[PDB]
Design an enzyme around this catalytic site. Structure first.
Site, short mmCIF file in Angstrom:
data_model
loop_
_atom_site.label_atom_id
_atom_site.label_comp_id
_atom_site.label_asym_id
_atom_site.label_seq_id
_atom_site.Cartn_x
_atom_site.Cartn_y
_atom_site.Cartn_z
N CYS B 65 0.81 -1.21 0.00
CA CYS B 65 0.00 0.00 0.00
C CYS B 65 0.85 1.27 0.00
O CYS B 65 1.66 1.49 0.90
CB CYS B 65 -0.93 0.04 1.22
SG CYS B 65 -1.89 1.59 1.29
N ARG B 68 0.00 4.56 2.93
CA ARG B 68 0.11 4.32 4.36
C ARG B 68 0.50 5.50 5.23
O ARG B 68 0.45 5.37 6.45
CB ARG B 68 1.09 3.17 4.64
CG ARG B 68 0.54 1.81 4.26
CD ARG B 68 1.57 0.74 4.55
NE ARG B 68 2.54 0.60 3.49
CZ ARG B 68 3.72 0.02 3.64
NH1 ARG B 68 4.07 -0.45 4.83
NH2 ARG B 68 4.56 -0.08 2.61
N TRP B 237 -9.08 6.22 -0.58
CA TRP B 237 -9.53 6.80 -1.83
C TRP B 237 -8.67 6.21 -2.91
O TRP B 237 -7.63 5.60 -2.63
CB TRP B 237 -9.40 8.32 -1.81
CG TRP B 237 -8.07 8.80 -1.30
CD1 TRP B 237 -6.89 8.89 -2.00
CD2 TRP B 237 -7.80 9.28 0.01
NE1 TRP B 237 -5.90 9.41 -1.18
CE2 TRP B 237 -6.44 9.65 0.06
CE3 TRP B 237 -8.59 9.44 1.16
CZ2 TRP B 237 -5.84 10.15 1.21
CZ3 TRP B 237 -8.00 9.93 2.30
CH2 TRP B 237 -6.64 10.30 2.31
N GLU B 242 -5.07 3.39 -10.59
CA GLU B 242 -5.81 2.15 -10.36
C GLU B 242 -7.00 2.08 -11.28
O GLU B 242 -7.41 1.00 -11.71
CB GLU B 242 -6.32 2.11 -8.93
CG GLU B 242 -5.23 2.20 -7.88
CD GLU B 242 -5.79 2.01 -6.50
OE1 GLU B 242 -6.09 0.85 -6.15
OE2 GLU B 242 -5.97 3.03 -5.78
C1 HEM Z 1 -6.09 6.49 1.83
C2 HEM Z 1 -6.01 6.19 0.52
C3 HEM Z 1 -5.30 4.98 0.02
C4 HEM Z 1 -4.60 4.91 -1.14
C5 HEM Z 1 -4.40 6.03 -2.13
C6 HEM Z 1 -4.11 3.58 -1.25
C7 HEM Z 1 -3.35 3.14 -2.34
C8 HEM Z 1 -3.20 1.78 -2.59
C9 HEM Z 1 -2.90 1.23 -3.85
C10 HEM Z 1 -2.73 2.01 -5.12
C11 HEM Z 1 -2.79 -0.12 -3.71
C12 HEM Z 1 -2.52 -1.13 -4.81
C13 HEM Z 1 -1.11 -0.99 -5.42
C14 HEM Z 1 -1.03 -1.63 -6.79
O1 HEM Z 1 -2.07 -1.89 -7.44
O2 HEM Z 1 0.10 -1.89 -7.29
C15 HEM Z 1 -3.04 -0.40 -2.36
C16 HEM Z 1 -2.99 -1.67 -1.86
C17 HEM Z 1 -3.41 -1.91 -0.57
N1 HEM Z 1 -3.89 -1.02 0.33
FE1 HEM Z 1 -3.99 0.87 0.21
N2 HEM Z 1 -4.51 2.86 -0.20
C18 HEM Z 1 -5.22 3.64 0.64
C19 HEM Z 1 -5.85 3.30 1.84
C20 HEM Z 1 -5.83 2.03 2.41
C21 HEM Z 1 -6.47 1.64 3.59
C22 HEM Z 1 -7.34 2.55 4.41
C23 HEM Z 1 -6.14 0.31 3.85
C24 HEM Z 1 -6.57 -0.54 4.99
C25 HEM Z 1 -6.97 -0.08 6.20
C26 HEM Z 1 -5.28 -0.10 2.78
C27 HEM Z 1 -4.71 -1.34 2.66
C28 HEM Z 1 -4.18 -1.75 1.43
C29 HEM Z 1 -3.90 -3.18 1.20
C30 HEM Z 1 -4.10 -4.33 2.15
C31 HEM Z 1 -3.43 -3.28 -0.04
C32 HEM Z 1 -3.02 -4.56 -0.72
C33 HEM Z 1 -4.28 -5.21 -1.32
C34 HEM Z 1 -3.96 -6.52 -2.01
O3 HEM Z 1 -3.01 -7.23 -1.65
O4 HEM Z 1 -4.68 -6.89 -2.96
N3 HEM Z 1 -5.10 0.98 1.95
N4 HEM Z 1 -3.28 0.78 -1.66
C1 LIG Z 2 -8.12 0.19 0.26
C2 LIG Z 2 -7.56 0.31 -1.00
C3 LIG Z 2 -7.49 1.57 -1.57
C4 LIG Z 2 -6.94 1.71 -2.83
N1 LIG Z 2 -6.90 2.93 -3.36
N2 LIG Z 2 -6.48 0.62 -3.49
C5 LIG Z 2 -6.53 -0.63 -2.97
C6 LIG Z 2 -6.00 -1.73 -3.68
C7 LIG Z 2 -7.00 -2.45 -4.61
C8 LIG Z 2 -6.43 -3.55 -5.31
C9 LIG Z 2 -6.90 -4.84 -5.07
C10 LIG Z 2 -6.36 -5.94 -5.76
C11 LIG Z 2 -6.82 -7.24 -5.52
N3 LIG Z 2 -5.73 -8.13 -5.06
C12 LIG Z 2 -5.37 -5.73 -6.71
C13 LIG Z 2 -4.88 -4.45 -7.00
C14 LIG Z 2 -3.83 -4.30 -7.95
C15 LIG Z 2 -3.27 -5.70 -8.23
C16 LIG Z 2 -2.12 -5.91 -9.00
C17 LIG Z 2 -2.14 -6.80 -10.06
C18 LIG Z 2 -0.96 -7.05 -10.76
C19 LIG Z 2 0.17 -6.46 -10.38
C20 LIG Z 2 1.41 -6.53 -10.87
C21 LIG Z 2 2.18 -5.75 -10.13
N4 LIG Z 2 1.43 -5.20 -9.18
C22 LIG Z 2 0.18 -5.63 -9.33
N5 LIG Z 2 -0.94 -5.37 -8.63
C23 LIG Z 2 -5.41 -3.38 -6.27
C24 LIG Z 2 -7.07 -0.80 -1.69
CL LIG Z 3 -10.17 -1.17 -7.86
#
Ligand code: HEM
Ligand SMILES: Cc1cc(N)nc(CCc2cc(CN)cc(CCc3ccc4cc[nH]c4n3)c2)c1
Ligand SMILES: [Cl-]
Ligand code: HEM
Ligand SMILES: Cc1cc(N)nc(CCc2cc(CN)cc(CCc3ccc4cc[nH]c4n3)c2)c1
Ligand SMILES: [Cl-]
Lengths: 361, 361
Positions: B65, B68, B237, B242
């Site tokens: 994330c 954070r 948010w 994304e």
């Molecule tokens: C406040 C705004 C937030 C932003 C902009 C944000 C941004 C992101 C983004 C962009 C990713 C995915 C990274 C990727 O696709 O490569 C991510 C993953 C994650 N975020 Fe955040 N996040 C936020 C808030 C939160 C909150 C509030 C939580 C939990 C309390 C959280 C927990 C996670 C987790 C667990 C993942 C990994 C999800 C997975 O493994 O599929 N995030 N975050």
């Molecule tokens: C709470 C929250 C906020 C936010 N703005 N974004 C998220 C993450 C949502 C998310 C969920 C999942 C499901 N596992 C996947 C992704 C991106 C997944 C993804 C998929 C492929 C690749 C390759 C490199 N990095 C990669 N990441 C993003 C979570």
């Molecule tokens: Cl999404």
């Protein structure tokens, strides 16, 4: 121990190499010749076939390289015969000329005599045979900051750069038995440079950007069957993003994005305008256009990734484990638009391979 | 064993949590209460302070994330009191409303009763509380392909989608003791959607793209001190990429790049034109513009990475090891333009944390 390491690496390599070459039956006899040679001399000498296939396998095993589809077409130049600094210099000049091939770049490696007691016969100081100097002093930055340390080392050897942003560093290498490296200015006739222009935006030439045609990595060690070729410069052609997204764009390199933004007519004021991303795309389009226009080989990252997918398919079909470093394989722009981004790679180190070695300066 | 795992996780968590809360002296007595509770009940109950700080630490430990920096401002809603499906439904509706906050998104987590004997009390089927359905049949693809399996599962429960590209999936969850999940249609008044328009290119609205305002991940397990909150949906948010570089752009998602290329007036014919990259930038600019225009929270990847750098600095200054997954932290467009790309991260798993769990369909 030293000798045991060598012998074990040789066994694995010869067995693998000969299997691939369909010479499986000759492994036993070759291994015997090698073991007695190691016993007698402390080392062994690769046949030209082993050396050539070794350098190719090393490329094929280079986890960080997206260009590996073409591993088997590597042009291997065996210069294990060189003994003098003029022979080394001419061999390096020759590599540049033959790899450049009037712009139709030939992936080439020139292999110099290998380390003996871990003792280098030829020590190349350049990171690439063709690279721009960098200077920093009195607040002022000129040229490529990545070359600052080598540039300063060169200027300690009596070389002096003109201090343009694009001074070609001389070749610089040290021979066994010499305390100081020697340096030789690159003949400019050897070095293809590409002015960077944009297909649609005429003002782009105002940036007066250019880059050299051929990236010739000259500071890595080729290891084949326990033999350490510390001096074995190799080249492919550029993937455009290396120039446009890194060399010209990185803040610690030429840092051109703000200037790019200005000439393409966008504000560089707000992160949300994604001006850096837009600048990067336009700079990268310019780089590809410019190389193509000049008849210099280059590949875009999409095509490169498609080629890499074929390398993956070829590996699977040949029954070879595929190794890769995802973090280097993804391109630095639109990585998610490539298949690489969406899968994972085993980053295991397989030999033969190319390895980092400590800088001599 | 089960109980020993619980007790060890509880000890580590309470010690760490109380240290951070300045309640170091209360650890001994709390640990005693917990051990006897575990002895008596097979489990223990978090205080509201532990649960809240636990959910925050879990976010702070989420390696993937980039968002954070704001971990300590997570709004934690404790719904461990729910027992009925209507209470669950209303708690989910409430989360959507309170997290959405009229567009000024509040990072929020709603925590439902935890697993008991590994037995779930509430099993949420949705991947996100707000997500679009997907359909595939008769050659035809409609909506979000990523939702195809859940959509089909829903339509087995008597729900039927209108088969637009943007059908909101209903909430779907199963209560302990029920064989089948129940589903509830989302009140549309709860769900903010953002039409995607471009600041400069009027034809962009011809694509009729939209996306929902708030990503509310609802299928991950929050683990705190050995307690498994399998149902604890949370949201932040969006970071624009994304939506623009993945949800709308991926070939296995909405696959809009060719259409984007067409409306922005560029050919989608040659890899070397970098039309996909240019389309991605324009689509991503549109997404950011559209969210900002609608007064819905969003962050661009540059700003997000700058915030993450501050999180790194805050971690170092607090004496906390920083963990991170580089492959998820880098944004999918212009990653090399962020500091993240140029450093490495320890991808160690630290608890509390959020974890994947098996899909119930
Ligand atoms: C406040 C705004 C937030 C932003 C902009 C944000 C941004 C992101 C983004 C962009 C990713 C995915 C990274 C990727 O696709 O490569 C991510 C993953 C994650 N975020 Fe955040 N996040 C936020 C808030 C939160 C909150 C509030 C939580 C939990 C309390 C959280 C927990 C996670 C987790 C667990 C993942 C990994 C999800 C997975 O493994 O599929 N995030 N975050
Ligand atoms: C709470 C929250 C906020 C936010 N703005 N974004 C998220 C993450 C949502 C998310 C969920 C999942 C499901 N596992 C996947 C992704 C991106 C997944 C993804 C998929 C492929 C690749 C390759 C490199 N990095 C990669 N990441 C993003 C979570
Ligand atoms: Cl999404
Ligand atoms: C034919 C054209 C070639 C292309 C387009 C190509 C592409 C690339 C690119 C883009 C990288 C860096 C990836 C990044 O920055 O993230 C790379 C790394 C590498 N390539 Fe290739 N390559 C080619 C040929 C070769 C050849 C001929 C060799 C050796 C015989 C080679 C060996 C390597 C090695 C060792 C690395 C890693 C370098 C390091 O660790 O610093 N490549 N390649
Ligand atoms: C033979 C050859 C051809 C070709 N087209 N490209 C290369 C690679 C040149 C190269 C050399 C070095 C020096 N170690 C670095 C790089 C890129 C380095 C780099 C730097 C940072 C990151 C972060 C993620 N990936 C990263 N990669 C690239 C070699
Ligand atoms: Cl380079």
């Amino acid at each position: 121990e030293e000798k045991e390491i060598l012998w074990n690496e040789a066994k694995a390599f010869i067995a693998a190499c000969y299997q691939e070459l369909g010479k499986a039956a000759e492994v036993k006899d070759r291994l015997a010749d090698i073991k007695s040679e190691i016993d007698l001399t402390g080392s062994y000498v690769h046949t030209k076939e082993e050396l050539e296939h070794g350098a190719k396998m090393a490329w094929r095993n280079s986890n960080r390289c997206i260009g590996r589809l073409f591993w088997n077409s590597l042009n291997v130049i065996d210069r294990r015969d060189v003994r003098t600094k003029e022979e080394v210099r001419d061999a390096l000049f020759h590599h540049i000329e033959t790899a450049t091939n009037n712009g139709k770049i030939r992936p080439t490696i020139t292999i110099f005599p290998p380390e003996e007691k871990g003792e280098k016969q030829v020590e190349i100081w350049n990171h690439q045979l063709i690279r721009y100097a960098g200077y920093e002093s009195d607040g002022e930055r000129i040229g490529d900051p990545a070359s600052c340390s080598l540039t300063a080392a060169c200027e300690e050897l009596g070389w002096r750069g003109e201090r343009t942003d694009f001074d070609l560093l001389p070749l610089i290498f040290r021979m066994k038995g010499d305390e100081q490296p020697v340096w030789y200015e690159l003949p400019r006739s050897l070095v293809i440079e590409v002015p960077i222009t944009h297909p649609d935006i005429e003002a782009f030439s105002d940036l007066e950007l250019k880059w050299y045609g051929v990236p010739i990595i000259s500071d890595m060690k080729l290891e084949v069957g326990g033999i350490h070729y510390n001096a074995a410069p190799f080249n492919g052609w550029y993937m455009g993003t290396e120039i446009g997204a890194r060399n010209l764009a990185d803040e610690k390199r030429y840092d051109k994005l703000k200037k790019v933004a200005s000439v393409i007519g966008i504000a560089a004021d707000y992160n949300t305008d994604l001006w850096k991303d837009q600048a990067l795309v336009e700079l990268n389009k310019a780089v590809l256009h410019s190389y193509k226009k000049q008849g210099v080989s280059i590949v875009d990252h999409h095509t490169a990734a498609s080629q890499f997918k074929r390398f993956e398919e070829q590996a699977e079909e040949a029954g070879r484990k595929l190794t890769g470093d995802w973090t280097w394989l993804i391109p630095p722009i639109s990585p998610a638009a490539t298949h690489i981004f969406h899968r994972s790679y085993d980053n295991s180190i397989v030999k033969p391979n190319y390895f980092y070695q400590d800088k001599p300066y």
